[PDB]
Amino acid sequence: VNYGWYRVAAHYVANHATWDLEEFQEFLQGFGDRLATWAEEEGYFAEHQSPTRQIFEDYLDRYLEIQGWESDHQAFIQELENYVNAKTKKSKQPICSLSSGEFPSEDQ
RNA sequence: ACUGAAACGAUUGUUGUGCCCCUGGCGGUCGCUUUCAAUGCCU
């Protein structure tokens, strides 16, 4: 619940108590852009992963066809292998509740 | 392991509370217990 920041904010809002909500939002938009520039001049944030692009490129490769595309037989073994292990310690995230689990899944 | 193995939409609850089959009403009207009779017969 990170109670400490509510004390920080309440000091800045008490010191500048003359503000209304809209001239406050004009402050905080400038505070965010300072934070953004400062974070990337120091390099203090990561180039985070891109997993949904990869599984989406593989979703297209299984299920989209234009006439005259080359096509392969799907490896349905991976869809069974993921079900056979869905309740076994060697599965890291839960299996999909809306589908078979042939693509990587994550908690809802 | 049947997309599996076990699997209570459940618990509690008043169709309730008030209510005059009520008000008005003459068993009424007409009607002779009537009609006839020797306290009699003799001293």
Automatic annotation (TrEMBL):
<protein>
    <recommendedName>
        <fullName>CRISPR-associated protein Csc3</fullName>
    </recommendedName>
</protein>
